[PDB]
Amino acid sequence: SIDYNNKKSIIKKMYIFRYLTDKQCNLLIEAFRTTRYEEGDYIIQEGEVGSRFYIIKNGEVEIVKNKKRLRTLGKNDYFGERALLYDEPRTASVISKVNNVECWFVDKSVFLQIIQGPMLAHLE
């Protein structure tokens, strides 16, 4: 309940999901799962092909390129959205800034199956 309503509230108001149907959105909310990181963990590694999208539940992360911090993201911020449409190398790294970081994430595998929904044929 609480975790569902939590990510529901965030997901539903996000720009990048504004075209989803309520049916799609519900599948999507249920598809997100929590993942935990400790201080200094690489959440995303620059140069790898991205396949996940992340929303910060607890904590902070930093976006890093060429060992330089580009910015800090905190609770309810999100990152990695291009991976949900494009198959391309990550342009930067994302590093867990503190212990006990928690993100909701979804893989493009799951997301695309959901976006595909309206293309699936009815019997009648």
Author numbering: 403 to 526
Question: Mind quoting what the paper says about this structure?
Answer:
The final model containing residues 403–526 shows four ordered sulfate ions, with one of the sulfates occupying the cyclic phosphate site due to a high sulfate concentration in the crystallizing condition. The N-terminal portion of the αC-helix (residues 520–526) forms a loop, providing crystal contacts with the PBC of the neighboring molecule in the crystal lattice. The rest of the αC-helix (residues 527–542) is not modeled due to the lack of electron density. The αC-helix is not ordered in the absence of cGMP, but becomes ordered upon binding cGMP and shields the cGMP pocket. In the absence of cGMP, the PBC is open with its αP-helix positioned away from the -barrel. The αB-helix, which interacts directly with the PBC, is tilted away from the -barrel. The α310-helix of the N3A motif interacts directly with the PBC. Three phenylalanines from different regions, F419 (α310-helix), F434 (αA-helix) and F455 (3), together with the hinge residues, L486 (αP-helix) and F513 (αB-helix) as previously defined in the CNB domain of Epac2, form a hydrophobic core that stabilizes the apo conformation.
Recent studies discovered that the P. falciparum cGMP-dependent protein kinase (PfPKG) is involved in both asexual and sexual development and specific inhibition of PfPKG blocked progression of the life cycle at multiple stages. PfPKG contains an N-terminal regulatory (R) domain including a possible auto-inhibitory (AI) sequence and a C-terminal catalytic (C) domain. Moreover, the R-domain of PfPKG contains four consensus cyclic nucleotide-binding domains (PfCNB-A, B, C and D), whereas mPKG has only two (mCNB-A and B). Cyclic GMP binding to PfCNB-D has been shown to have the greatest effect on kinase activation.
